[PDB]
Amino acid sequence: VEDNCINFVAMKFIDNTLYFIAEDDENLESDYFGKLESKLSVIRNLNTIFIISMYKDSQPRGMAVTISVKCEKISTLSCENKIISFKEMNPPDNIKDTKSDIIFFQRSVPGHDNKMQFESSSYEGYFLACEKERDLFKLILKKEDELGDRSIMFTVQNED
Amino acid sequence: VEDNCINFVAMKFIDNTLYFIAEDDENLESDYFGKLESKLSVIRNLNTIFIISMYKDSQPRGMAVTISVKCEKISTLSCENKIISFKEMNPPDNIKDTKSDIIFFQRSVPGHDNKMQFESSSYEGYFLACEKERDLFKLILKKEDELGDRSIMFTVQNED
Amino acid sequence: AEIYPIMDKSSRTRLALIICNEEFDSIPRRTGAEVDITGMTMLLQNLGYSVDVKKNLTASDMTTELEAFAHRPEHKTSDSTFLVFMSHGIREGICGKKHSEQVPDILQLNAIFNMLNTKNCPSLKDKPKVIIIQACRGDSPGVVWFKD
Amino acid sequence: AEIYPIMDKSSRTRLALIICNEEFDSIPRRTGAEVDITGMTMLLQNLGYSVDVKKNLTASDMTTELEAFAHRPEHKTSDSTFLVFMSHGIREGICGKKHSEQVPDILQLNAIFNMLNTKNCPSLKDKPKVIIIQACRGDSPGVVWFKD
Amino acid sequence: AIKKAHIEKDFIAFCSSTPDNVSWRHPTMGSVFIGRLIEHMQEYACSCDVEEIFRKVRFSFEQPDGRAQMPTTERVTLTRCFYLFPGH
Amino acid sequence: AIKKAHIEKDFIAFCSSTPDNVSWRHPTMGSVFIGRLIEHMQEYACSCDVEEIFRKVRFSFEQPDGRAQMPTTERVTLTRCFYLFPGH
């Protein structure tokens, strides 16, 4: 069964915080008899930017990936000191130390084996995901193993 | 399965012989994978007359039925002397002797239990039916138990 | 002669059926069905139909209700019909009041067509059967992400 | 904007498929299919479609040929398609060349629709798939007698 | 008397979605499919038959809007254009 | 780079007979359903779309003539009127 839960199209950051609107805004309910609790949300690239860049590791324990979002000056997502934060400026090309907030590891998902989740390099065992907040969606770190609230998993669509 | 084989609409007698045309004249073949060998042919009353009259028997061994066809003077089908024949004139109201060519017995058919076959009163064990002859259909007596050629069974549709 | 016959307004007696399932016994409720029933009934009443509204019917009762609708006399005086359905839907067909994943109670569309054919409903010969169904037919958002 | 797009004659390269099953290994032949093929091909060529006649294909061959037709590079320069199917058929769907009672070999209509959607045939997005089928779907003569 | 007629004729089903998809319904405004269906008969039932009204409903769902669906016109055995003519 | 596109958006099936019936075929003239279909595409394809052409074919089989059958327009998911426009 192709269990799909689309919840992302495109949305910008507000107040130094990354916001994401969903495709549905009226909370329409399905007529299928069974429940449809969401488990992933992946789809994007619908035509406010969302940078992903790959890096090569001399110590390969996972493909190195970056996230950044365009600002007045480009901002990169950061994971310093066991908290979530957005740091500004651009990455210094190839990163020298492996332990950094710039680089992330991508792990394949059980769903269709076409998408990948994101893994912190500065944290070992933590997990980046999203949770329902008010009418929008807020990207907040939460452990994948622990079922925190609904625990919507954050994945991105790969190029064919 | 509602196995139906319609082969009769309406047709008159020619040369003192009862002829019957069929609904199909081009011998169109079905696209169903299995064969469709005909077994009965019942339907009539589509808007050249075909008389059936019921009689009451003081010795009831089957419902008494007559066949007649309008002519210059009405003709009744006859079964005298182990042969098929058409005799002219009208029946003499209630028939006195049970053994006659005028009266026939109707027996229910296994197909939909709505139609009935015809049984000779003058013959015991014989059966009235029809067989394919040239482009038309010819009513010729043939034993139901014996599989003579295709042995299309002759039945008529009863009133609801 | 490309249009259907339409009988006189002052004498025709049309008939339509509006079956909706809102409250179930093992399924989350179909909220908002009340407005649906009200709007559909108002529209058909404006159109000129004698609306029959039923709620929370098991498929077994559903079938006998269809048979009763077919056997009603107004059909001899009508020229069309409407069978608007509103319930949950499995790929097999329409979900009833007592439907469950353990034992299914599903009214197929083929059965609905059979209960209103010329043989079973001789009153509706050469008369449209404009069926309207609002239900699901599978588990898929209905969209795919192809790489343009 | 109620009419599908139609591009230039001199540059459009449509593709229409015509599958027929005339010879069988356990079924009586479908006589007259030759005239059907000739007429369908002539009419489609008049329309402007590069026809593709195939005869006596098993359901597996049906599927692989359908996938090859979907993957053909001429779809990107077209605006429609035709899939004329003419063979024997039962309630389930189309009959293959190797059909038998003991082992069925049926190409369902659902499979034909599935193997031409936007996911499996991305070159045909927003382009009609006008399927034509000539096959039986049951045993009943299709007519009934009712006392009026 | 016993004039013949087709067993199955003059049927037009109209499902909410194509086979193997789902259908949505607003919790208060009512079902989106039914809402569009009733709006299209409120606006077009006097100028388009059932087939074309159903086609307009189908076209109204062409461009997806997140919670997308596609009405389907099953088993269209109709033989002539059917105008409701509400009150003529 | 990525759209939704409504998987199974544009489709029109056209079966020879309604479900649970039989379709005929002339041994030499060709299939009766196909023959009527090609006649109607030869005569009407320049002035009637595929939907109305199929409706004309269906109506041409209305009155039974012994070997009766009834074409069926399955899963009509068309969004716009489809004119073939042969040679134009």
Q: What are phi and psi of A64, to 5 degrees?
A: -80, 125
Is residue C70 in a domain? yes
| Cβ-Cβ contacts under 8 Å, B31 against chain D | 30, 87-89, 134-136
For residue D34, the SS3 value is helix
* Coil, helix or strand at residue F33: helix
Pairs across A and F, CB distance < 8 A: 7
Helical (H) or strand (E) element with A150: none
Which domain covers residue D121, as residue numbers? 15-134
Helix (H, G, I), strand (E, B) or coil at D106: strand
Chain D interface, Cβ < 8 Å to E: 2, 110, 113, 140, 142-148
CB contact under 8 A, B23 and F67: yes
**Which residues on chain F are in Cβ contact (under 8 Å) with C142?**
6-7
User: Angle of helix F50-59 relative to helix F32-44, nearest 10 degrees?
Assistant: 130
Q: Which domain holds residue B86?
A: 19-27+37-157
Phi and psi, residue A152, nearest 5°: -70, 130
* Number of CB pairs, chain C paired with chain E, less than 8 A apart: 150
Nearest CA in chain F to C111: F19
Binary contact (F7, C143; C-beta < 8 A): yes
Asked whether the beta carbons of F17 and F23 are under 8 A apart, the reply is: yes
Q: Please tell me the distance from the alpha carbon of residue D130 to that of residue A83, in angstroms, as a whole number.
A: 58
**Strand F24-25 to B29-30 pairing:** antiparallel
Return all residues near B15 (Cβ < 8 A) that are at least 6 apart.
none
Q: How many domains does chain E fold into?
A: 1
F and C: touch, per 3+ CB pairs < 8 A? yes
Resolution for the entry shown, Å: 3.5
What string of DSSP letters covers B58-85?
A: SS-SS-EEEEEE--SS-EEEE--TTS-E
A23: which residues sit within 8 A by CB, 6+ positions away? Answer: A6, A7, A8, A9, E65, E66, E67
Q: By CA distance, what is C12's nearest residue in E?
A: E87
In a domain, A32, yes or no: yes
Task: Say which residue the tokens 């003419």 belong to.
Answer: D86
* DSSP string across C111-142: HHHHHTSTTT-GGGTT--EEEEEE---SSS-S
B/e letters for E11-23, b = 16+ CB within 10 Å, e = fewer, are bbbbbbbbbbbbb
Total domains in chain B come to 1
Closest CB to D146 among C119, C144, C146: C119
The number of folded domains in chain D is 1
Catalytic residue among C20, C75, C88, C95: C88
Computed over its alpha carbons, how large is the radius of gyration of chain F? Answer: 15
A106 belongs to a structural domain: yes
How far apart CA A43 and CA A65 sit, in angstroms, is: 18
- Inter-chain touch C145–F1, beta carbons under 8 Å: no
Name the nearest CA neighbour of C5 among C117, C80, C83: C80
C132 to chain A nearest CA, in Å? 15
User: Which CATH number fits the domain that encloses residue C83?
Assistant: 3.40.50.1460
> CB of C62 within 8 A of CB of C38?
no
Q: Is C3 on the interface with D (CB under 8 A)?
A: no
Cα gap C110→E75, rounded to integer Å: 10
- Pick from E33, D36, C109: nearest CA to F75: C109
Test the E interface: residue of B46, B50, B114 with most E CBs within 10 Å: B46
Q: Tokens for B54? A: 């019921």
Residue at B88 is within a domain: yes
Region of residue D120 (left: phi > 0; alpha: psi -120 to 50; beta: else)? alpha
Residue B3 lies in a domain: no
Residue among A116, A123, A113 nearest A153 (CA): A116
For an interface test with F, which of A24, A42, A46 has the most F Cβ atoms less than 10 Å from its Cβ?
A: A46
CATH number of domain containing F29: 3.30.70.1470
Shortest CA distance to A64 belongs to which of A101, A102, A109, A105?
Answer: A105
Q: Does F32 touch chain B (CB under 8 A)?
A: yes
8 Å CB contact of D118 and F5: yes
**Does the active-site annotation cover C88?**
yes
Domain region containing E24: 1-88
- DSSP state, residue D122: G
Neighboring chains of B (3 or more beta-carbon pairs < 8 A): D, E, F
Residues of D catalogued as catalytic: 88, 136
Q: From residue B102, give the alpha-carbon distance in Å to each of B61, B65, C56.
A: 16, 8, 61
Q: Does some domain include residue D108?
A: yes
Domain with residue B138: its CATH number is: 2.80.10.50
**Per the domain annotation, does B2 fall within a domain?**
no
Does some domain include residue A1? no
CB contact under 8 A, C144 and F1: no
- CA-nearest of B33, F39, F17 to D87 is B33
Q: What is the DSSP code (8-state) at residue C9?
A: T
In this complex, the chains that touch E, judged by 3 or more CB pairs closer than 8 A, are A, B, C, D, F
Residues 6+ apart with CB under 8 A from D102: none
